[PDB]
Predict the 3D structure of the following.
Amino acid sequence: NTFLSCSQYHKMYRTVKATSGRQIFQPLHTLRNAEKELLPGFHQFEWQPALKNVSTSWDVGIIDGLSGWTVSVDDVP
Amino acid sequence: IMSISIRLEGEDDGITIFQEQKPNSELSCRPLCLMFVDESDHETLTAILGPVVAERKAMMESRLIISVGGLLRSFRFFFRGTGYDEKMVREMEGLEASGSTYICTLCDSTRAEASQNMVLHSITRSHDENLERYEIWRKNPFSESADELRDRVKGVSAKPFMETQPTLDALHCDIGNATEFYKIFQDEIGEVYQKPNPSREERRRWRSTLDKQLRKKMKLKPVMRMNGNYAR
Amino acid sequence: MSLQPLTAVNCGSLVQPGFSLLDLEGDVYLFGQKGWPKRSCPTGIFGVRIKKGELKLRAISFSNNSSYLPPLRCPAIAHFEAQDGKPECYLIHGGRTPNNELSSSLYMLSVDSRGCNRKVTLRCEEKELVGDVPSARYGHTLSVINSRGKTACVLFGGRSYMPPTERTTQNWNSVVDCPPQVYLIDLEFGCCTAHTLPELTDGQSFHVALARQDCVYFLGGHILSSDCRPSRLIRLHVELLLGSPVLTCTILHEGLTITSAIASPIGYHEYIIFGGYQSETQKRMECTYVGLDDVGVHMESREPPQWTSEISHSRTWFGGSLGKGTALVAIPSEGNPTPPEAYHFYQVSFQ
Ligand SMILES: [Ca+2]
Ligand SMILES: [Zn+2]
């Protein structure tokens, strides 16, 4: 929410930890793992009826928007 | 997500459970697709956006089951497609662009017949019948002329591909009106109905004296384009 | 056999890598403009004029008796030769629309009047096709043949989207070769008939064809399932032994390894073939001439004109046949600023 960078965060965390005796800012890997729930593609659900010509999975995250183009340079690239 | 209401189990014409308070400030605007393309070239935009259209069309009927608060519950959906620029409005609607003669997006009168009477029109446009009119265009079952069919079918020339309720963009809604009052005053300084043709600079001289007039009383510097501030 | 660079006068944002050229009665017409028809031309078809290297495009009009054609991208062109009943026609089907939906609807184009001032009026009639219909596809090939003496048409090749069984919204823009069945089209009426042959192992696409005297030859192209571009020239011979169009074909030894070629007919059955791409990485650079007769294909390698260093070193390109030894090649130019006219055009001429 304040656009802070990542190595930024770890340096800041080193600072606050070493400074005053307490663990105030949660470290990196636990941060990412705790965050991973909030992105799309985490929570199992169901659909009645099943959708038309749509995949059955629910875990897939960021799909490449190319949408599976045959890279063959004969067609429009 | 604009609003979630309740339905169980009688008439429930409306029981708002959560109606979003600040639906404009971007802190409620979730992005879902991004492409390094331009707004103009219909080609790549359709080519990528297609899948999302298929999801739209496949979702509106079937119903969803989600485990929330320990309870597995059902969910239905509508869709109100508004967030498009007028250019994109008619582009997704397939209609001509942009300074055409079929100015409206819900009535089908042209420029002039809308100029005759202003406040007497009924809303007709909807995605389905625009699809229908395009089909009539394509088959052309009456061997009509170019312009004759163009008029009879109400300027439908390209198969639209995303149902959007063509609602007014509240944002500008004034800039045309602002410059219209500007023109009213520019033709009020110069007595118009006695002299039906102001000259090249007479119009500009009238705008100049009007500008220093409103600089005298309301103190507004000469502006080029009627953005929000000056218009308000 | 030489190139001359041209200059794009105007309307430079109306040509795209996929397009076609209908050459007929002098004035030749470009079909397949990018984007939906603009108001400057509700037809979309343009008439192309060349004057001291200047490439101008005028907005051809329509008839009144005519239906209106969306700007299809890569249909199968077939010059329906001038004869009974109404000379002379161009068969177009079916390509894919600017919105990625395919036509699966045959179209036929003809000329009506002129000028009075050089103006060549046109008409575009849909001919409904019943069957046993050909499936919607793109990049395939259509041609005309005449058997004792009745005239029919032949369709073959082409890829398509996954049928609406596993057409999934993450593979929603993938393609697969259509099942290789040639289709036989009667123009009157469109009682299309499907046919097969155990020699039609698997259907390839982008393969320019050549028909003559009720015998056709299919040249090199590109197939995906094996990812190879095989060099097996194909011939087929049909006979309209009514009420059966009974067919056979034959493999040949040598077929060139070329895709998306620029075919200019010079003589009776003399075709100078430029060839677009040798393999999926290296463009085809040189030229080719093919004669044909009952003997068969007579290959030859003519003089390749020295392409300029820029076109020599560009990755890809395209073009069309200006007809009669003349042709147009277009190269996507990379440079700042994008004018947006980022396309260079060379007029190539044989002899
Ligand atoms: Ca805009
Ligand atoms: Zn209206």
Notes: Residues B 85 surround calcium ion (ligand 1) (CB under 6 Å). The CA atoms of residues 320 and 328 of chain C lie 5 Å apart.
